[PDB]
Design an enzyme around this catalytic site. Structure first.
Site, PDB file in Angstrom:
ATOM      1  N   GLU A  49       0.997  -1.146  -0.003  1.00 52.09           N
ATOM      2  CA  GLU A  49       0.024   0.064  -0.066  1.00 52.09           C
ATOM      3  C   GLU A  49       0.875   1.217  -0.166  1.00 52.09           C
ATOM      4  O   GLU A  49       1.537   1.361   0.865  1.00 52.09           O
ATOM      5  CB  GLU A  49      -0.858   0.062   1.401  1.00 52.09           C
ATOM      6  CG  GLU A  49      -2.089   1.178   1.097  1.00 52.09           C
ATOM      7  CD  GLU A  49      -1.767   2.081   1.885  1.00 52.09           C
ATOM      8  OE1 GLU A  49      -2.229   2.527   3.162  1.00 52.09           O
ATOM      9  OE2 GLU A  49      -1.125   3.220   1.453  1.00 52.09           O
ATOM     10  N   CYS A  75      -1.569   8.656   4.255  1.00 48.46           N
ATOM     11  CA  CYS A  75      -1.636   8.298   3.042  1.00 48.46           C
ATOM     12  C   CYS A  75      -3.069   8.673   2.381  1.00 48.46           C
ATOM     13  O   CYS A  75      -3.706   8.717   1.340  1.00 48.46           O
ATOM     14  CB  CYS A  75      -1.600   6.854   2.864  1.00 48.46           C
ATOM     15  SG  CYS A  75      -2.255   5.623   4.382  1.00 48.46           S
TER      16      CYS A  75
HETATM   17  O1  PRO Z   1      -7.938   6.385   6.549  1.00 50.09           O
HETATM   18  C1  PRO Z   1      -6.993   6.636   7.290  1.00 50.09           C
HETATM   19  O2  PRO Z   1      -6.792   7.870   7.656  1.00 50.09           O
HETATM   20  C2  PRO Z   1      -6.198   5.700   8.116  1.00 50.09           C
HETATM   21  C3  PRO Z   1      -4.933   5.148   7.365  1.00 50.09           C
HETATM   22  C4  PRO Z   1      -4.808   3.603   7.264  1.00 50.09           C
HETATM   23  C5  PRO Z   1      -6.082   3.330   7.174  1.00 50.09           C
HETATM   24  N1  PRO Z   1      -6.787   3.996   8.541  1.00 50.09           N
END
Ligand code: PRO
Ligand code: PRO
Ligand code: NA
Ligand code: NA
Lengths: 516, 516
Positions: free
Chosen positions: B288, B322
């Site tokens: 990812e 991200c």
């Molecule tokens: O969506 C977000 O902000 C965090 C990053 C990885 C999954 N949860």
């Protein structure tokens, strides 16, 4: 959409006079059409080229069974453009509509069963039952994937709710990809590898194996008659690496579905891991890359049942199967009784022109003949030749059922995939040693155990490291739906064909939340 | 095993005096414990080294939060041997037993929750709520995967029966693999990437991000207390690429689970595609690799609601996500009203030491500061700086919330992942153009739309090509189970975390037939 629960298409045994008459009518129709030329199929139309490829009858290779157009890079690029254009709308079809199209293709294929079987007989040297099994498996893939795709339909994903929001996760297809199909199941595997991705909304450019371009074109006639929209399926027969390399390496190829040799499968997986200039995704490459499949027999087994299953597994379609028994591992108590029975059975196998329904037809080509006879020469240096081991008379590529005994577990003929009618027999002390020897290859596709001892079967269930394991029966002929098919280790990526999980490989998932 | 249905761990907002009192004590205790040393964890024991690594406080980098041992190739090889040794027996634990171990780990983590949150505040500069979301997410991964794993238990595969036979398909774990975790969610993502594979019977060697080695070590204190058998989980902090490279390229590494930058993800995927000398399988690599995530606002939206969500999405944890909104795509009628509201809100944001619970803490390191400042300098050419664009006063790595307007869609700052508090505002004509601009990046991770028009929302649901899409709400903070998390394109391989599908990536399938 509601259809009957999936059942496997019955494999014809040709025990009735009607079935035999129908086969003779089909063989006649097919040979009357040996003059036919089959173009490429790109963007819903048959598209001819100036160069051509010729397909030969391996039971009489001076006889041509048909010719096809020959694709190069430019035709490859044109199919890729058609496939992406098609994807734009094909992805948006209701799953029910896509699945009905597949069900139409299956019905068309079922109605042309004998014709396709006769084409396999003449083009790739399958006897009648091997041919019928191959076509029945193709029909099964279409029937099974048509149903299995519905299990993924909008919105299929089980998610946890959250107060004040709708949370919806669903699958979408990947895009346009390339299929690189084998010659040994050039109806069944050719069809399954194409229609799986296509069922759920992908588009496909299919490159048939050079030895089986005529039957692949006949499968495409079925696709065309079924009404796949232009660009959804594309047919690119070609000679050598040009077409396959161009597409595998292309920045705009989304996925690659391959069945063939480990040598080629390795190159494909490596290339798929690279970002070509301007590429905007991580390619998915699914590979099935053959095996070195063993049957173990211990002293408790039914030795007659074992010898029959071994002969079927070793010599069905001349042992030109990724699932073929190429090793026979016998514990001390089983060694002489089973070896004696296998030799007596194998010595009675007929070999001849495939249209006569011999036990064995020819191997598929002059190159295959060369490879198999080369391995025979190696085997003579490594073990003790006790049956066959030679070419048989006739222009056709006829090789005798061959058995080497006292073969060392690490010999080249006990390690490398010969893909011909050559069985290596390895003597071991006991079942523990048998399992060690069974596992000690780079491969992990099929395997079998004949034994009445429950503890040994259940031990194998846990520790005989192959993707498809069979107790007290043949190790070939995995049925769609019944035995998910795919291996471990250097037999490939464990993409299980004829299983619900196969279609997931050709999907990605989106999660969409609305806060109200 | 029967437990309560999954619910998400509540995220502490620290509004009650009780919660602030508890958080103040936890932070004080962590601060009082600065300088502690944490060894490697290999084969069930803590193992120290001569060399050490230092973890600094980004809010005050003269302060050492703690030190750890430093792994080299030798320690990596020892962990691999320990992991494979463990796998031999860990694979055979009943799934219920493995899942109960995960549930124990979750309970221990829940009990240490304020301490873990405080460690995040100091070691990676998260404010209080960002720290609590991160630890809650970790607990959620453990709780979720422990339950999801049972859905795969022996024999889980739906197959078609055949007369006279048992056909049984079931999943098995792959083996020993490597986890390479990020610094931005170094409890949550670190935990999820390890326990997912482990739950279904794999073994893992985990390399924490250098900036977050202390909190990774505290997670490993939890694994140890929970009682994972020796070798099942291993902790190998290290400097630069030596450890990760050694394992990624190793012939005996079965799988790689990576979350991080696209640059590193590309190299990993290419390396996994290669057959290292003596390797006997095709490596799986799950990556990812980040995003360039946009929020679209049209003239029908609640502009106040949109501005709030945009500011949370762009600046939460200093935009080091991200999932962060780094692009704001505004139609002509939305442009002025929304930008005004974003600017007014953004200018009110506090920036300071994370322990103070500011709106923004520091960026994570001197290297990140350098990168983000360098991108700001790039942006000053490409767009028009209208807010921020400066380092703030202090030893800590403090950067002002930054906004550039009139940014061309193909500008470096509109295409490349900055991973700091820097928002690029892009003007477009209408919703159709907004989607085109949204889609025209190499990425496809998160995205958002603020709109009251049903047709625009449902059009985006179909055509805004990101793996996690949100309407009328922030685009960060995806919850385990609720929003399967993972993207398309160069955001990675779409391995959806917090979803039933994730665990299937760490399993292969065996089909075993017995003919009676
Ligand atoms: O969506 C977000 O902000 C965090 C990053 C990885 C999954 N949860
Ligand atoms: O198992 C077999 O022999 C055939 C070949 C692919 C799957 N079915
Ligand atoms: Na041929
Ligand atoms: Na740090």
């Amino acid at each position: 959409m509601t259809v009957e629960p999936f059942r496997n298409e019955p494999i014809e045994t040709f025990q009735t006079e009607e079935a035999r008459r129908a086969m003779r009518e089909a063989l006649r129709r097919v040979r009357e059409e040996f003059g036919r030329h089959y173009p490429l199929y790109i963007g819903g139309e048959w598209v001819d080229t100036k160069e051509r490829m010729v397909s030969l009858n391996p039971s009489a290779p001076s006889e041509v069974v048909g010719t096809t157009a020959k694709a190069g890079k430019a035709e490859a690029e044109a199919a890729l453009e058609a496939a992406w254009k098609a994807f734009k709308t094909w992805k948006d079809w209701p799953q029910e509509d896509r699945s009905r199209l597949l069900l139409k293709a299956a019905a068309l294929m079922r109605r042309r069963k004998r014709e396709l079987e006769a084409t396999l007989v003449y083009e790739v040297g399958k006897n009648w039952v091997e041919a019928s099994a191959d076509v029945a498996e193709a029909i099964d893939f279409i029937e099974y994937y048509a149903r299995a795709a519905l299990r993924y339909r909008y919105p299929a994903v089980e998610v946890v709710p959250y107060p004040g929001e709708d949370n919806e996760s669903f699958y979408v297809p990947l895009g346009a990809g390339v299929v690189i199909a084998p010659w040994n199941f050039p109806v069944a595997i050719f069809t399954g590898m194409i229609v799986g991705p296509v069922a759920v909304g992908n588009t496909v450019i299919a490159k048939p194996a050079e030895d089986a371009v005529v039957v692949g074109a006949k499968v495409f006639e079925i696709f065309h008659e079924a009404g796949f929209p232009p660009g959804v399926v594309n047919f690119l027969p070609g000679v050598g690496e040009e077409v396959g390399a161009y597409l595998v390496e292309h920045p705009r190829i989304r996925f690659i579905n391959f069945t063939g040799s480990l040598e080629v499968g390795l190159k494909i997986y490596e290339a798929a891991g690279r970002l070509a200039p301007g590429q905007t995704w991580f390619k998915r490459a699914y590979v099935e890359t053959g095996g070195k499949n063993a049957i173990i027999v211990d002293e408790t087994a039914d030795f007659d049942l074992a010898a029959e299953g071994v002969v079927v597994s070793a010599y069905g379609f001349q042992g030109q199967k990724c699932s073929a028994a190429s090793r026979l591992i016998l514990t001390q108590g089983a060694y002489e009784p089973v070896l004696e029975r296998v030799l007596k059975r194998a010595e009675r196998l007929s070999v001849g022109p495939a249209e006569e329904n011999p036990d064995l037809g020819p191997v598929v080509s002059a190159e295959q003949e060369r490879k198999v006879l080369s391995y025979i020469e190696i085997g003579k240096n490594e073990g003790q030749l006790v049956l066959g081991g030679k070419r048989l008379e006739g222009e056709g590529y006829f090789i005798a059922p061959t058995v080497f005994t006292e073969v060392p577990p690490k010999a080249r003929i006990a390690q490398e995939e010969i893909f011909g009618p050559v069985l290596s027999v390895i003597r071991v002390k006991d079942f523990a040693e048998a399992l060690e020897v069974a596992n000690d290859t780079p491969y992990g596709l099929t395997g079998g155990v004949y034994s009445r001892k429950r503890e040994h079967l259940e031990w194998a269930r846990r520790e005989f490291h192959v993707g498809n394991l069979y107790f007290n029966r043949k190790i070939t002929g995995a049925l769609v739906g019944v035995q998910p098919f795919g291996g471990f280790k250097l037999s490939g990526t464990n993409a299980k064909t004829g299983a619900l999980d196969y279609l997931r490989l050709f999907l990605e998932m989106k999660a969409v939340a609305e806060r109200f």
